[PDB]
Structure 1
Amino acid sequence: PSWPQILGRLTDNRDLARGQAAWAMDQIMTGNARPAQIAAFAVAMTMKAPTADEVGELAGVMLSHAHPLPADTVPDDAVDVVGTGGDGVNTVNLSTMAAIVVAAAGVPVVKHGNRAASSLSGGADTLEALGVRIDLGPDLVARSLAEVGIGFCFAPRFHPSYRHAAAVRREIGVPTVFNLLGPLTNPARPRAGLIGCAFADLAEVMAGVFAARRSSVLVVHGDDGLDELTTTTTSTIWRVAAGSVDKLTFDPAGFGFARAQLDQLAGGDAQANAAAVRAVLGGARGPVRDAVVLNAAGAIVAHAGLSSRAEWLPAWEEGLRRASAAIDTGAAEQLLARWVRFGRQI
């Protein structure tokens, strides 16, 4: 393989041969690619239209180089709640809030995350503001998961060899296939998740990668552009189970959710978004709570999907009940406090 061969094939609007995307990502991860080559590859793959096989190869190479968690420390039913980011809406941290609520319901959560790229405060920024240790290594993330019920894998901590690609993503500024990689490369490799995708045209491809792994995931794109299940309108869901993908449209009105305005979900700096987390966990009612409960329920539905017996509507109803109860009993608020104490007691 060579860069001229691979890049030439992409600019010819052709799918890559098996193994070529992998070779490219390996060159990138081993420090052997010039920034110009990295950028040309990211752009060319995006404009060709990436296939699930290709994106799967990219994510597979990243995972092969990532720091793993210790043997037998991640439950077979652990879930992730994470999105691509890049929706350009600057909301409160819906995935992070949902993750806390899901863990409080008793579903093990190992969340992959990072600081903000374009928004005012990303999941990692907000957790930091709440006093959570975001940059623990493999052994301590495993310990967090076992003792608290949730662990957070900071992407830069677990994927240090991606640093050159991460720099190129920032330099070019335009979204590319690389923006899909975060949700696809959780180093703990959980088999379930609620996975947000800001890019309507790339969501089916992400779903295809998860299908190949036989994960149970809901890949979600709010029809208002959110990389979350939205409350302002419908969301498109690519449901992944039994190695298959099927496309659905989801309307929260079917479960009694009132319509919100996008401005009602607006986020601020890390202190503001941390205050938003505390308000929800403290039982404040309103649009933010509704969106958190909806997303937590989605992640519980994906968890349920790890069983072949699970049915869609009963799963949502149970998920909504469990999410609401986790907040209402104080379990979610207490879990966050316990998570903060865990990090200080190490």
Structure 2
Amino acid sequence: PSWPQILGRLTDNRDLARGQAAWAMDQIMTGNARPAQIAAFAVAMTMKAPTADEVGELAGVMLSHAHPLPADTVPDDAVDVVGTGVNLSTMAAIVVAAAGVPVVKHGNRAADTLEALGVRIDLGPDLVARSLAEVGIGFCFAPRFHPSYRHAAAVRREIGVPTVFNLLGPLTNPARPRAGLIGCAFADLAEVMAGVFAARRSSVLVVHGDDGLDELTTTTTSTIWRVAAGSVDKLTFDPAGFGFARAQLDQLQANAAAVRAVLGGARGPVRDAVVLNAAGAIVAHAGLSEWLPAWEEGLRRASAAIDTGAAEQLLARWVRFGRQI
């Protein structure tokens, strides 16, 4: 295999042969790729239109190089709550964890929201494991678990344009949770991302707000690719069906204040959006083992996690956990 071979195939608008995407990603992560080669690959794959097989190979290589969490430290039913791209997902994650569903998130700075809240984001595998056990939630700092991806990440920022690489974050949570609510801002790639989760037998709702959000929106309908039993089912979701009023898009350090307000019981469109996304994660969680009863239960659990103060308390306990390390 070679870069001219692989780049040539892509520029010819052909799908890659089995293993080729993997070879490319492994070159990129073993420091064997020039920035120009990385950029050419990211762009060419994007314009060719990536397959789930291809994106799967990319994510597979990344996870093969990643620092794992220690053995038997991630519950079988842990979930992620995240988008391709953060205020809504951070809150939803806390609420989901507070409802009793273990959450392990994965991210990087532009993570900023959590720091502003007093959470310690840069922990190693053993301490993330302890956080997950003792608090019910953990955060994997992406640079710390994916050191070899730094070359790729640098090129991402240099070219600016979105590419297939924008999918890899949610697909390479180093804790490897089997479930989640996953936002995707790119309607065409959402389906591909869903296929990758399907191949892994994950239980995920891949969500794309029809207003463009990488979260379940309250301003209008959302497209959901429901992934369960290795298959993908495409659905349109209307929050009005669960009694939610339509919000305006503009209503959705600043984030930290917003987090404190919602967890404190503030009513409004932000809370509604948090509750909706938290419920989505809980439905995805239920999928590891009916759509309407599942959503109704998810919504009850999410609302109760806030209203009882459990979500607010969990964040406080999370903050305290880090200050005691």
1:100-138 deviation per Cα after TM superposition (whole angstroms, max 9, x unaligned): 000000000011122239xxxxxxx11000000011010
1:342 paired residue number: 321
Residue 282 of structure 2, aligned match among 287, 300, 309: 300
* Number of matched pairs: 324
CA–CA separation in structure 2 for the residues paired with 1:71 and 1:173:
37
CA distance in 2, matches of 1:312, 1:290: 19
Shift of 1:156: 1.1
Deviates more, 1:209-218 or 1:108-117: 108-117
**Residue 113, structure 1, aligned to residue 100, structure 2:** no
Please state how far the C-alpha of 1:232 moved relative to its aligned partner. Answer: 0.4
Regions of 4+ moved over 6 Å: none
Alignment match, 1:87: none
> What are the ranges of 5 or more consecutive residues in structure 2 without an aligned counterpart?
none
- Cα distance in 1 between the residues matched to 2:143 and 2:303: 33
Determine helix, strand or coil for the equivalent of 2:187: coil
Secondary structure, counterpart of 2:106 in structure 1: strand
Deviation per CA, 1:46-73, whole angstroms, max 9, x where unpaired? Answer: 0000000000000000000001000000
- What are the Cα deviations for residues 191-246 of structure 1, in whole angstroms up to 9, with x where unaligned? 00000000001000000000000000000000000000000000000000000001
Q: Say which SS state the counterpart of residue 33 (structure 2) adopts.
A: coil
Cα distance in 1 between the residues matched to 2:231 and 2:98: 30
Identify the residue that residue 241 of structure 1 maps to in structure 2: 228
SS of aligned partner of 2:188: coil
- Residue 130 of structure 2: SS of its match in structure 1? helix
Structure 2 CA distance, aligned partners of 1:290 and 1:113? Answer: 24
Once the 2 structures are TM-superposed, how far is the Cα of residue 157 of structure 1 from its aligned partner? 1.1
Residue 79 of structure 2 is aligned to residue 97 of structure 1: no
Secondary structure of 2:186's aligned partner: coil
Question: 1:47 is paired with a residue of what secondary structure?
Answer: helix
Partner of 1:222: 209
| Aligned equivalents of 1:305, 1:115: Cα separation in 2 | 31
Which secondary structure state, in structure 2, belongs to the residue aligned with residue 54 of structure 1?
A: helix
2:93, 2:254 → 1: CA distance? 19
Give structure 1 stretches of 5+ with no counterpart.
Answer: 85-91, 118-124, 266-270
> Equivalents in 1 of 2:260, 2:100: separation in Å?
20
Cα deviation for residue 276 of structure 1 reads: 0.1
CA distance in 2, matches of 1:14, 1:201: 18
SS in 2 for 1:198: coil
Q: Which residue does 2:52 correspond to in 1?
A: 52
The counterpart of 2:150, out of the listed 163, 166, 175, is 163
- Residue 202 of structure 1 aligns to a residue in which SS? helix
Q: Normalising by structure 1, what TM-score? A: 0.93
* DSSP 3-state at the match of 2:205: strand
1:326 aligned residue: 305
Report the Cα offset of residue 323 of structure 1: 0.1
Give the Cα separation in 2 of the matches to 1:115 and 1:294. Answer: 25
State the alpha-carbon separation in 2 of the partners of residues 199 and 241 from structure 1: 21
The Cα of 1:12 is off from its aligned counterpart by 0.4
TM-score by length of 2: 0.99
